[PDB]
Amino acid sequence: LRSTPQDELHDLLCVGFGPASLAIAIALHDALDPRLNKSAAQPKICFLERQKQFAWHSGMLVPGSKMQISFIKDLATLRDPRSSFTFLNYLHQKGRLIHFTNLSTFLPARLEFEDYMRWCAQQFSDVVAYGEEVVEVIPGKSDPSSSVVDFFTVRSRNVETGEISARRTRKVVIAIGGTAKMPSGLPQDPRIIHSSKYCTTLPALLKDKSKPYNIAVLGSGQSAAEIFHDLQKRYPNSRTTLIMADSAMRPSDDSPFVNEIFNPERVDKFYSQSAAERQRSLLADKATNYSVVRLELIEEIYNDMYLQRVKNPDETQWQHRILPERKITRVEHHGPQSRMRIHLKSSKPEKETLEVDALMVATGYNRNAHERLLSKVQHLRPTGQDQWKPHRDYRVEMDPSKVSSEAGIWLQGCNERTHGLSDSLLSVLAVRGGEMVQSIFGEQLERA
Amino acid sequence: LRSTPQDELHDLLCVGFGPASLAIAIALHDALDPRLNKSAAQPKICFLERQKQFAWHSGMLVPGSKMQISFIKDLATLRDPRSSFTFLNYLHQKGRLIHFTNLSTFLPARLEFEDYMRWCAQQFSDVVAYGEEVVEVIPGKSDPSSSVVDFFTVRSRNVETGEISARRTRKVVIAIGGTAKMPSGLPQDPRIIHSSKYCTTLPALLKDKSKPYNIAVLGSGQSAAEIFHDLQKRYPNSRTTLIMADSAMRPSDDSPFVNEIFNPERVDKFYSQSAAERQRSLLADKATNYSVVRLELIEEIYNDMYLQRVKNPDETQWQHRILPERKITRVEHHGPQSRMRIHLKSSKPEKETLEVDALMVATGYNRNAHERLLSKVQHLRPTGQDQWKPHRDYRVEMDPSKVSSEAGIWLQGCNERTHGLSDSLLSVLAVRGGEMVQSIFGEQLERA
Amino acid sequence: LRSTPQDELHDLLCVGFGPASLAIAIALHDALDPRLNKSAAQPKICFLERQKQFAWHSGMLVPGSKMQISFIKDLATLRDPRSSFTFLNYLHQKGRLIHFTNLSTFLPARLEFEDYMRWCAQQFSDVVAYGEEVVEVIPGKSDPSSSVVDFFTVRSRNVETGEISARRTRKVVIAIGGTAKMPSGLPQDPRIIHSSKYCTTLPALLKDKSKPYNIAVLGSGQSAAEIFHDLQKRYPNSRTTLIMADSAMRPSDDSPFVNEIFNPERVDKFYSQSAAERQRSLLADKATNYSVVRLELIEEIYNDMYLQRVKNPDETQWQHRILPERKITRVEHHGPQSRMRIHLKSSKPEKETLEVDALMVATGYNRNAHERLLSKVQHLRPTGQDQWKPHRDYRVEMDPSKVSSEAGIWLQGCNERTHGLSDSLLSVLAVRGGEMVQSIFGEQLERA
Amino acid sequence: LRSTPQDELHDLLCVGFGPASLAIAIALHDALDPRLNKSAAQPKICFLERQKQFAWHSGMLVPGSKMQISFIKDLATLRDPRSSFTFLNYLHQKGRLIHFTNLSTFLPARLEFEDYMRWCAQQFSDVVAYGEEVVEVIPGKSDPSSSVVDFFTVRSRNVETGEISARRTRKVVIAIGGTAKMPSGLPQDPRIIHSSKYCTTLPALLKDKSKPYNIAVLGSGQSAAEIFHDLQKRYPNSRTTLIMADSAMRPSDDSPFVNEIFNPERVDKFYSQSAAERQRSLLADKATNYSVVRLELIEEIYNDMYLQRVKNPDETQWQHRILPERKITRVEHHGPQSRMRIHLKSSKPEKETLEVDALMVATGYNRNAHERLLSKVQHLRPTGQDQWKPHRDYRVEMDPSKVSSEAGIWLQGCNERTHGLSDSLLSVLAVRGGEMVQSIFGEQLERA
Ligand SMILES: Cc1cc2nc3c(=O)[nH]c(=O)nc-3n(C[C@H](O)[C@H](O)[C@H](O)COP(=O)(O)OP(=O)(O)OC[C@H]3O[C@@H](n4cnc5c(N)ncnc54)[C@H](O)[C@@H]3O)c2cc1C
Ligand SMILES: Cc1cc2nc3c(=O)[nH]c(=O)nc-3n(C[C@H](O)[C@H](O)[C@H](O)COP(=O)(O)OP(=O)(O)OC[C@H]3O[C@@H](n4cnc5c(N)ncnc54)[C@H](O)[C@@H]3O)c2cc1C
Ligand SMILES: Cc1cc2nc3c(=O)[nH]c(=O)nc-3n(C[C@H](O)[C@H](O)[C@H](O)COP(=O)(O)OP(=O)(O)OC[C@H]3O[C@@H](n4cnc5c(N)ncnc54)[C@H](O)[C@@H]3O)c2cc1C
Ligand SMILES: Cc1cc2nc3c(=O)[nH]c(=O)nc-3n(C[C@H](O)[C@H](O)[C@H](O)COP(=O)(O)OP(=O)(O)OC[C@H]3O[C@@H](n4cnc5c(N)ncnc54)[C@H](O)[C@@H]3O)c2cc1C
Ligand SMILES: NCCC[C@H](N)C(=O)O
Ligand SMILES: NCCC[C@H](N)C(=O)O
Ligand SMILES: NCCC[C@H](N)C(=O)O
Ligand SMILES: NCCC[C@H](N)C(=O)O
Fold first, then answer.
1. How far is the centre of ligand 6, averaged over its atoms, from the C-alpha of C301 (Å)?
2. Any idea which positions bind NADP(+) (chains A, B, C, D)?
3. Pick the CATH number of C1-448 from 2.120.10.30, 3.50.50.60, 3.40.1710.10, 3.60.15.10
C-alpha cells in the first residue's frame, strides 16, 4: 500500500493498529490482489497507532505463555487460506514450517504469534503512523454553511514531541482495544499495578530477582493465573499470594459445541436477537472467556500446590498460597516500610492481613474509550440517543439528515453487547476484516 | 455378619441396598475387624432391597460406559486403604490387578465397577433381604400407655408374593436413591421412556435392531448424551434426534480446585453455612454434576456429527441430529401409526415436527421418596416443622420429648441441600459409611 | 491443464495417478500459476491410471480409520501454503473449515483425506486417462538408423475393452506404488485375502454380517490391527484371531526428534550417505513405519481385550484373541467344509489349530513392479548394471552414449533404499512434486 | 521387627537396604502379620546399608522428576493391596490421599516416591545397620574339620570410623544395585562426573548458579535428558550441549502389550527360555528401559529447542544444543584454564571442538559388584563354573557336597540375563519380596 500525504482527504482513517486494524489492512490488501480477487486507484488509507512500533499486549508476554486459540484462526486463513498473510505462510517464509509441524500443536507461544502479527504489520509500514495517540474526532462540513456533515477530522498527539496533527477522512474506524479496569476501592500506588503493565513496570519496581519479596495477585482469570505462576519462576525466593472472590479457579470452556459461538457465521445469529436474548446469551456462555483459566495451567498450578503439601502439610507455611472467597477491604500504604498492608475479609454477603511489596491487579479491561474520542460527534446521533448503536456491519447509527451517506464511523472490538463474545477476540478477525473492507470500500471495489 | 430373625428387635434397619447402604455395611464390617480396628456381640442389622439381587443402575449400563470418578473413590479406600473392600483388592481377588494397571486409567467401565460392588455386596447376603420393597415406617412405643416413641416398625411388600412383613428396630436408615423425574407436560405412553429404563424396556418396545426407527432423546446431561450415542450403535439404521432446551451440550467440571468440593472433609464446611450461602454455593458449582457431559463423550459425538458433514453438507439430511434451544409443546400419540408426533418450539421466552417410534427422556431424578415412607412418623418432628431436617450426622431432628435418645431415623443420598453436591454421588461414601457407623453404633463400639 | 492428442509426442507421461503423481500435477499447476510463480506454451502431459476413477487404498478405507500424518503434510502446503491445493483451502471450498478447526485434530479420517485428494485430482481430468493399465515402456529412436534413444513408447491396456494404446514421450515417470506381498508358504485360495482387498473382496466372500464366522488375521502392523479391530464391529458375532510372529503389537515412533527423518530437507542428507550407512539408518528407524501400530489403536484393542477378561477370566473362551509368537506351518483348504484348517507353531527358532472361514493377510507390499514395465529399456543402463540406479532427482542412470539428454525415466515411491523412509509415504510429496517439475520441465520453465 | 545382637548367628543377612531389600523386609513383615496371613519366634534378620540413612538415587533427585511406573507397582500392592505398606496407605497416613486423587496421575514425583519408601524404611530401623559398607562374604564351617560349609561371615566397614565388623548368618542376600559405568576412553577428572553424582557433586564444582558455564552431557537415555533439561533451569545463563552417538533421543515403550513383559508372572516364562532365546528377547524389548526417554520429556525438550529457533534461526548460536551422531575422541584437561577441551568425531564407522567447565556422563550402570564381595565363596560353585548361576528363586547354585542345604546366597537386582528386564526395576519388587520370603524362610513359616 502507498502512503497518502497528511493534507489529503482520506477514504479511511483507522485509530489503532492492533490485531483488529491489522486484519482490515490484510483484508484490503487481499481484496486488491488480482491473484486472490478476480475483480482487482488505491484507496487513501492511514492507520494511527500510539505505540512506537507494532506490539501485542507486551506487558503480558509471560515466558512460556501460549495462545488460547487455534493458529487456523489467524488474521487471514478463515477468510482465505491462499492469503500470503496466513500463519502457515509466515512459518514457511521464516523457514520454520516443518519444525512447527513436528510440535503437533494448534497453540503457538504468544511470543511466536506476536512475531507473526509483527511480520504481517511490517508490510503496511507505509500506511501506519506510529507514535500517534488519537485525542479526538471532529465533524466536518465541506459546505460550512450547510447542515450536512461529510467528513471527519482526526487529531492525534505525537507521543515524543507532544505535537498535534490533523488528518481528514470520509470514514473512521475506531479499533483501540481496552483500557485497564481497576477496582474502585483500591488507592493509587506505584506498588499497585494492573496486569497489563506486568512485564513492563513490575521489574522496575522490584529490581532484584533474588530477594524474598511478598507479592499479591488479585483476580481469578487467565491473567491472574499466568502472573501467579510466572512470579514463582521470575522471583524464586518470593512469597506469592493469589487473592480471589470466587471459591476456585475455573476452567475455560473450549468444548466443541459450546465453542461454535465463536464461529464467524454466528455473528449474524447473535446480532439478530433482541437486547434481552443477547444479554441472556452472554451470561450463558460466560465460562468461555470471562474470569476463566486454561485447564492445563490450572492443573500445573494445582500440581505445584500439591508439591508444597508433600514438603510441608501446614498450608500456612507455604511459599505460595491461594486465598479463595476473599475481598480487599483496606490497603495501608502510607507506612514507613517498603510493604503495603492488605486487609482481607470474606467475599460472602451478610479475616487475615497481608504485607506485600507489590499487588498485581488482574481485573480485566474497560472498552468504553471510544466515547471520549467521539464526544464532539455525539450530536450527529439520532435525537435523544445517548449511546452509540453499531449496525451489523459495525457502522454506528447517525442521523441521515445530519450526515452524508459517504461519511461514517465504524467501531471494532468494543461491540460484545451487539455482536457476541468473539468481538474482542482474535476469533473472527479474518472474516470481519473482509466484511469491513466491503462495508467501507464496497462502492469503490464494485467499480473494478 | 450373622442374620437376625425377623421377630427380633434390630439395632439398625436399612432401607435400600445400593452403594450408600453397601458403604455402611462395609464400614461396619471394618469397624468390627480386629485387623483394622484395635478396639474390636454383633449388632442386629438388616438391609431391605426391592431388587431381587444387587444391581447398580442396570437400565443405564450402556455398552462402553465409563465411571466419572477415580477408582480411589471406591467404597472403602478413602476411609481405609487396608480394607478388604477396596477396588484394588477386588481386582487382586479376581486375578486382574496387573492387567488393570496396564490400562493406565482411573476410570473403570461402569460394568466393571458394578461387578466390584456386586462382589462387595455378596459378602453381606446373610443380612440383606432382597425382593423387599419398604412401604412404610411406623412409630412404636415399648410402653404403649406412655407418650415416648422408642422403636420403629418397618413394613415391606414382597415383590414376588405381595406379602407384607414387619420388622422392628431402634434405628432406621433410608438410602433409597432417586425416582424418575418426568416433565409434567408429557403424556403417559409406552413409547415415552425415562433414561433409567433404557437398557431394560426400550429393546422390548423396539425389538428389531435392524429397522429404521425414528428415536428422539430429550435432555442435555450425561444420560442424554450416552443414550444418544449408544442408539447409533444399537440401532445402526435408526434416525436419532437429541432435543435440548440449552444451546449446547456442556462439559462437566472436573478441574482440580473446583473438584475439591467433593472432598469428604468439605461436608463439614458446607453443612455449617447458612441456608442462603448453601443455596448460592450449589448454583455456583452446578457445572460439576448437573446437566453436564464428560468432555471425552462430547468430543466423540461432535466428531460423529463432523463425519456426517463430510458425507453430506446438508444438516437436514443427517441420520443423527441435535436440535438445540427447543422445547416440546405437544405430543400426538393417539394416531393409527406406530409413531408419535412431537411438536417443537423455541426454548426462548417471549418450529418443526418430529415423528418418532420412541422418546427417551433423560431429565434426572427426584429425591423425595422418603417423604411417603415417613408419613406416619411426621408428627414426631418439632411442632410446626413441615420438612425433615437432617443433622450433620444425617439423623433427622425429632422432638426430644416424643422420641427416646436410643431411637432415630437417618437419611442418605437425598441431602444435597444441607450436605452438598457430593451427597447423592459415590464421592464420599467410604468416609460417610465410617461416620454413619459411629453415629449409629457409637455407644456399642465404645464399650469394646 | 489442456489435453494432448494420443498421437503427439508428449513432454511427460506419468504411469499411475495416485498421491505421488497427483503431487507432480499440482506442483506443475503451481509452477505455471502467475499468482504463485513470478516466472509464469503448456507442456504436453498425460497421466495413465488403471483404476476407473481416482481412489486411494479403497480396500483399506476402514470405518473410523485415521491419517497417520499431520494435514500440514498435504499435497501442497510444505511447498507453498498459498497454493489452492492445500487441505485448508479444500475445507474452505467445501464450507467445512471452521467445523474442522473445532475438532482440534491434525489427523483427518482417511475418508476425508481421500476426498481431499479426489477434489484435487478432479481438477486434472483433462490430462488423466483412467482405465489404462500400463504394460510396457519401449525405447524409441527418432533416427532408427542411429544408436541413440531419444523417446519412449508407453503401451497401456484398456481395462474395459482390453485394447492396447501407444503414447510417445521424451520423459517417463513411474509412480505405481506397491503390489500385495504374500508369504511364499501360503497356498492360493479365495478365503485367503490380502489386506489391500479387505473392503473390496471380503464382504463378497462373507455376505451375512450376522453369522458366527471364524476369521484370522496374519500380521502385526497397522493394517493387521485396523482389520482385527474392524472385524469385531463389522461381524459382531464373529470369532477373530490375530496371528503374529512378534511377541506384541509395537507402537509407531512419532516422537519429534526421530520424526525429523521425514523432513523434506533430510532426503539430501540420506541420499548422500554410502550404501552401508543407508542400510544401517533404515534399520535404526524401522519403528517409525514398518510393522508398527498407532498407539491410540493399540490402547483401544488392549482395552477391548481387558473388557473380555472382565467378562471371562479364561482367555481360551474369548470371542476375540491374539496369538503372539506364532507362525503358520500348514493350511488345510481342500476339505468338504466352508472352513480352512490353519496349523500353527512357535515363531521361535530351534502348537494349536484354527478353523477359519477367511484369513486376512496383512504382510505389506512389494515395490518392484517397475522392473516388469522397464524390461525392454534395461539394455540402456550402463554396461553390467543389473539394477535401476536413481539419481537424487529420481532420474534413473542411463548410458549417455545410448540415450539423449532430453530423454529419461524417473521413479517415484519405490526409492526407500536411496532416498529414505519417507519415499513411499505422503510425508515429502509436496516438496518432491516441486523438485520433480524442476528436474523434468526445468529448461522449459527457465525460458519463461 | 526386633533386633539381633551382632554376635548371634542370623537366619538372614541382607547386603544393601535399597528398594529391593526393603521389599523383602516389607514382605517378611506381612508374612508375619496375623491380619494378612492366617498362618502367623521372629527370624534373626539384619540389613546392612552403606548410606547413613535411607535414600533412593539422591544424586538424581532432579527438581520436577517423575516416576516412570504406576504407583500401583509400589513395594506391596501387587502382592497384597491390604498391606499397610502400599502407596495409598502411605498417603492416607500423611493426610494426603484425597489431594493426590485430585491430581489424576499414576506417576508421583520421584521426591514423593522416595519419601514413601523412606516412610516404609523407617519402620525397620531396629533391623537395619546404616553406615555399614559390606566388603566381603566368607564361607564358614560349624565343624572346621569337615568339608561342609553351613554358614557365612559378612564383614563390613563402618563408613565413619573405618572399623571392621563381622556378622554370621546361614543365608545371605546381595541387593546392592549398580555401580557407575564410565566409558573407558575418558580420563579421570573432577570436571567429569557420572549422572549418579549430579545433585551431589556438580553444585560443589560449579558453585555460582548465575555464571555462564559451558556444560556438556554425554548420553541419550532418561538420565541424560533429565540432566540436560534441568541444567537449563539450574544454571539459567549456562551453555549446555547434549552429546550422543545415536541420531536422536528415542521414546520409552510403555504401550500396554509390550509392557506386559514387566508383569510379575512373566518372570517364570522368561526364566524357562534357553540362553539364546533370553538373549534375543532382551534385545527385542530394549526400547522399554534402555537408552530411552519418557515421551513427555522428549516433547518438552523439543519444544524448548523450537523456542530457540523462533528467537534465532541459526542453530550454531543457540544457548542449548544437541549434537547427534557424535563420539568423544579426545579430552584435553591439563590446560591452564577452568575449561576442558572436548574433541568430537562422527559416531559412524569407516568434527567440532567444545570447551566445557563440566562434563556430565549419563552412561548407565554396571551390575557386577557382587563378584568382588563373593570372591572367597567362588570355590563352592560346581567345579569349572566361572559365573554365578541364580535359580528361579534367586539362590545361586552351589556344590551340594560342599554346602549345607540350610546355607545359601541369593542375588537381587543383577539378574536381568536370567530373570528379564524387570529385574533391576521396581516393577516386580512387591511380588518378588513375597517369593524371597518363601524361598528363605519357607520351612520356618511352614511350622506355623
Ligand atoms: C494477556 C492476553 C492474552 C490474550 N490472548 C488471546 C488469545 O489467545 N486468543 C484470543 O482470541 N484473544 C486473546 N486476547 C484478547 C485480545 O483482546 C485480542 O487478542 C486482541 O488484542 C484484540 O485486538 P484489538 O486490535 O481489538 O485490541 P488491541 O490488541 O488492544 O489493539 C488496540 C491498539 O490500539 C492502540 N490504541 C489505543 N488507544 C489509542 C489512541 N487513542 N490512539 C492511537 N492508538 C491507540 C493500542 O496501542 C493498541 O495497539 C488476549 C488478551 C490479553 C490481555
Ligand atoms: C447412569 C448413572 C451413572 C452414574 N455414574 C456415577 C459416577 O460415575 N460417579 C458417581 O459418583 N456417581 C454416579 N451416579 C450417581 C448415583 O446416584 C450414585 O453413584 C449412587 O447410585 C448413589 O447410591 P444410593 O445407594 O444413594 O442410590 P441408588 O444407587 O439408587 O440405590 C438405592 C437402592 O434402594 C433401592 N430402593 C429404592 N426404594 C426402595 C424401597 N421402597 N424399598 C426397598 N428398597 C428400595 C433401590 O432398588 C436401589 O437399589 C450415577 C447415576 C446414574 C443414574
Ligand atoms: C492402509 C494404508 C494407509 C496409509 N496411510 C498413510 C498415512 O496416514 N500417511 C502416509 O504418509 N502414508 C500412508 N500410506 C502409505 C502410502 O504408500 C502413501 O500414502 C501413498 O499411497 C503413496 O502414493 P503413491 O502414488 O506412491 O502410490 P499409490 O497410492 O499406490 O498410487 C499408485 C497408483 O498407480 C496405479 N497403478 C499401479 N500400476 C499401474 C499400471 N501398470 N498402470 C497404470 N496405473 C497403475 C494404482 O492404481 C494407483 O492409483 C498408507 C498406506 C496404506 C496401504
Ligand atoms: C535416576 C533413576 C530413576 C529411576 N526411576 C525408576 C522408575 O521410575 N521406575 C523403576 O521401576 N525403576 C527406576 N529406576 C531403576 C532402579 O534400579 C530401581 O528403581 C531401584 O533403585 C532398584 O533397587 P535396588 O535395591 O535393586 O538397587 P538400589 O536402589 O541401587 O539399592 C542398592 C542399595 O545398596 C547399597 N549398597 C551398595 N553397595 C553396598 C555395600 N557394599 N554394602 C552395603 N550397602 C551397599 C546402596 O547404598 C543402595 O542403598 C531408576 C534408576 C535411576 C538411576
Ligand atoms: N480466549 C479466546 C477464546 C476463543 C475461542 N475458544 C475460539 O475458539 O475462538
Ligand atoms: N459425576 C460425579 C462427579 C464426582 C466428582 N468429579 C469427584 O471427583 O468426586
Ligand atoms: N505412517 C507415516 C509416518 C509419517 C511420519 N510420522 C511423518 O510425520 O511424516
Ligand atoms: N522405567 C521402568 C519401566 C517399567 C515398566 N514400564 C513397567 O510398567 O513396569
1. 27
2. 220-223, 245, 289-291
3. 3.50.50.60
